């Protein structure tokens, strides 16, 4: 009647053709208008298998964001192969908008509506949709920002928890606001993010008890990344076209998980960055004048589990990320493409 299949999708958005904002410009030419009033069909007595970690929809979204970032976030200096590439690097208007992903004729998307579906396994409550929900192509590491939330309990996602090389997506059920600001009035690159410590330490405690559920009640420990580039050893994200790097050591303070005020994380705006799209560093212009500010919802955490042989009663976790495909996985997990026959 139908079968799992991979096909070329098309996007839909409510982009405004009159906006200078780069996401709106990209979606104006790339996407079609949103369906005025769609309608999903619940599939009765149907159990379908989903695998968020082998979902072709993730690949296509990755191509879009790479395309969006290369058409509108071009740097002053870039390392293509072995040559240096000079070019203009004007400041842009940058604010991600939601993008819907739709199937062409002869195909359809199946949607897993199981409240606590972990992404890999069977799903007893399935429906078919013409398009997905509006996903914002938010590029970040360590913390997943401005995403959707789990409808009930926190969810631990991983193709396999035994494999310490597999990223862990902690899907939160209650956002924790992060308020990052580069003030108007010394060093024009100094910034900081403020986070509600009372709220964060409580959410982080509920994350430990959910991890205990998956690791034989072993003690859960959080540590800062052991090494790697600044884009993964720190919370890396883009705000108003500026690239922020924030020290998150205070967000994983083990003593405060069972200390609860305003956590001010040291941040820095960097002009020289290691591109997530592929290879090479990129150099941009210094930050814009004025008060640069971004308030985002922390809706998920990216974790890498230590391979401590499991002989110890502990289990250390460190904020991961870097593979931006994981960010799209956290939003496309409930979807999959099938072909009609």
């Amino acid at each position: 009647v139908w079968k799992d299949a991979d096909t070329t999708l098309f996007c839909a958005s409510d982009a405004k053709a009159h906006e200078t904002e780069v996401h709106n410009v990209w979606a104006t030419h790339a996407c079609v208008p949103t369906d005025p009033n769609p309608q999903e069909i619940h599939l009765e007595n149907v159990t379908e298998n989903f695998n968020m970690w082998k979902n072709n929809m993730v690949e296509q979204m990755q191509e879009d964001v790479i395309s969006l970032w290369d058409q509108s976030l071009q740097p002053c200096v870039k390392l293509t192969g072995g040559s240096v590439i000079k070019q203009a690097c004007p400041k842009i208007s940058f604010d991600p908008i939601p993008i819907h992903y739709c199937t062409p004729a002869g195909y359809v998307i199946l949607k897993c509506n199981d409240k606590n579906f972990n992404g890999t396994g069977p799903c007893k409550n399935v429906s078919s949709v013409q398009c997905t929900h509006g996903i914002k192509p938010v590029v970040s590491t360590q913390l997943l920002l401005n995403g959707s939330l789990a409808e009930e309990e926190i969810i631990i996602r991983s193709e396999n928890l035994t494999n310490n090389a597999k990223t862990i997506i902690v899907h939160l059920n209650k956002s924790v606001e992060i308020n990052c600001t580069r003030p108007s009035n010394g060093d024009i690159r100094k910034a900081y993010c403020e986070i509600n410590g009372t709220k964060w330490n409580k959410v982080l405690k509920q994350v430990t008890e959910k991890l205990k559920e998956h690791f034989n009640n072993k003690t859960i420990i959080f540590q800062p990344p052991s090494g790697g580039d600044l884009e993964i050893t720190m919370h890396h994200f883009n705000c108003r076209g500026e690239f922020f790097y924030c020290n998150t050591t205070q967000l994983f303070n083990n003593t405060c998980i069972g200390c609860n005020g305003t956590i001010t994380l040291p941040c820095k705006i960097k002009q020289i960055i290691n591109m997530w799209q592929g290879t090479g560093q990129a150099m941009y212009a210094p930050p814009i004048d004025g008060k640069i500010n971004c308030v985002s919802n922390i809706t998920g955490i990216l974790l890498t589990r230590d391979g401590g042989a499991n002989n110890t009663s502990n289990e250390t976790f460190r904020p991961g990320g870097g593979n931006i495909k994981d960010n799209w996985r956290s939003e496309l997990y409930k979807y999959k493409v099938v072909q009609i026959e």
């Epitope: 494999n163 310490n164 993964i232 592929g278």
Partner: antibody, heavy 122, light 104 residues
Framework: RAHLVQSGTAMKKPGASVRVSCQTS????????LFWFRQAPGRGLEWVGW????????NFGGGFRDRVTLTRDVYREIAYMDIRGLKPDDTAVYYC???????????????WGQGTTVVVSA | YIHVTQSPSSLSVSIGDRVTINCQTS??????LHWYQHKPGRAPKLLIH???SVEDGVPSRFSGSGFHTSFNLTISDLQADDIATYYC?????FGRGSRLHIKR
């Protein structure tokens, strides 16, 4: 296609440190995890750690995080392993191997370096 | 921890013979079981990944089978190049190996 070549054998006293390097070629360097294993004489392969070259994310086996540093040069496509505080029982052949899986991780190692013999003796 | 045991540890073999060696697991492993060949002084070589998928370039006489906690590496029409130790692997856990030596 993929081919990994490691550095020559090392002679170190106790307490010293060592750097084993692993030059790669013939494939997309950042799309493949690089693992580090060692084999002491008579024993089986022991896992040291891995590194994802894209941003240099690392992970280690039992007790190796405290003395091993794993870095890479994405441009020269070469991976490094720095071991500090060498003990006599660190004597082994250290191997550099690549994951066959493009992007993801399967732990199936289809490309291997010839190995690097490291001896720690006073 | 996934303890990997291979039997027989040592094995007397003769050219042209069919050989089959077993690898067992502490826990259910499914199918991501990998087989390697290792000769002294050289680097190991990937023979089969995920139980039954033989790597390109490996002689067709190599084969793999098994599931869950028991996996077999089979060679039909053994040759002088197939004499070596053979490791099975899951994640970071390599087996001690099973060494072949010609029988006289």
């Amino acid at each position: 296609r993929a081919h990994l070549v490691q550095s020559g054998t090392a002679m170190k006293k106790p307490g010293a440190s060592v750097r084993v390097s692993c030059q790669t070629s013939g494939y997309t360097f950042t799309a493949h995890i690089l693992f580090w294993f060692r084999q002491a004489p008579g024993r089986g392969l022991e896992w040291v750690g891995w590194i994802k070259p894209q941003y240099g994310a690392v992970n280690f086996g039992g007790g190796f995080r405290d003395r091993v540093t794993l870095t890479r040069d994405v441009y020269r496509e070469i991976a490094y392993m720095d071991i500090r505080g060498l003990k006599p029982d660190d004597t082994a052949v250290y191997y550099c191997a690549r994951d066959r899986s493009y992007g993801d991780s399967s732990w199936a190692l289809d490309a291997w370096g010839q190995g690097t013999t490291v001896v720690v003796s006073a | 921890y996934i303890h990997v045991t291979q039997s027989p540890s040592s094995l007397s073999v003769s050219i042209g013979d069919r050989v089959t060696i077993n690898c067992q697991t502490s826990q259910g492993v499914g199918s991501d079981l990998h087989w390697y060949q290792h000769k002294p002084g050289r680097a190991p070589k990937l023979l089969i990944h995920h139980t039954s998928s033989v790597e390109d370039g490996v002689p067709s006489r190599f084969s793999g089978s098994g599931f869950h906690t028991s996996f077999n590496l089979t060679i039909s029409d053994l040759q002088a190049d197939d004499i070596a130790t053979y490791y099975c692997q899951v994640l970071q856990f390599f087996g001690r190996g099973s060494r072949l030596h010609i029988k006289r």
